[PDB]
Design a protein around this ligand. Structure first.
Ligand code: 2XS
Ligand code: ZN
Length: 205
């Protein structure tokens, strides 16, 4: 069963404010002209909850400990965004690499820009948007994403692979041409904790 408890953050909470700040301030314009994630300069944040799960926390702490001693006591933790159709499963069971499907590999994908993760909320390339209106840019329907602690360890900089390279703990596609914004990939579910569940809407400009 799940040992997951959702704690509601009051909007007047400072923690609530730091999270939304991170989410708002990392919005970027993407190459697709808003095709996948929609068109917006801002979110409307409805809810932000802390995911509390003890066994999950320990699995994260145990792995981070291992990565640390593998990487000169640097676990290289970053707060990163995740988007996918499987948020509800993740807050209950945790990220699972066995659930990774076919992108740029068979791993778990994170973005430093919330708007990039927002592109995955309704599927790869935004699917066909919200269920009701089939609108990738719907300003009505509610969306969710995650703000996660991720153990990057020693990252590899690069197209499709199964695991991190020898001596590494994560793969990062850095902008170059090539990518517009960084993508962070891990191939072990316990190297990310789904810290905050964010429920939101995109706002019409
Ligand atoms: O941990 C994941 N899913 C799940 C965890 C635990 C229980 C589950 C039960 C059912 C389904 N998924 C579960 C999960 C793993 C990888 C992805 N994932 C990505 O992060 C990349 C790809 C993917 O499948 C897809 C293309 C880019 C993004 C979205 C999504 C969810
Ligand atoms: Zn809709």
């Amino acid at each position: 069963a799940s040992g997951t408890i959702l704690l509601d953050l009051a909007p007047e909470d400072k923690e609530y404010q730091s999270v939304e700040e991170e989410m708002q301030s990392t919005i970027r314009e993407h190459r697709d002209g808003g095709n996948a994630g929609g068109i917006f300069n801002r979110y409307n944040v409805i809810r932000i909850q802390k995911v509390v799960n003890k066994k999950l926390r320990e699995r994260f702490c145990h792995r981070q400990k291992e990565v640390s001693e593998e990487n000169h006591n640097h676990h290289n933790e970053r707060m990163l965004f995740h988007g996918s159709p499987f948020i509800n499963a993740i807050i209950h069971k945790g990220f699972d690499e066995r659930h990774a499907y076919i992108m740029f590999g068979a791993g778990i994908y994170f973005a430093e820009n919330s708007s990039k993760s927002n592109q995955y909320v309704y599927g790869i390339g935004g699917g066909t948007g919200c269920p009701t209106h089939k609108d990738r840019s719907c300003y009505i329907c509610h969306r969710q994403m995650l703000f996660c602690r991720v153990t990057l360890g020693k990252s590899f900089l690069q197209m499709k692979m199964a695991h991190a390279p020898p001596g590494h703990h994560s793969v990062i596609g850095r902008p170059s041409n090539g990518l517009a914004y960084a993508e962070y990939v891990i191939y072990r579910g316990e190297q990310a904790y789904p810290e905050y569940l964010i429920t939101y809407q995109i706002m019409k400009p």
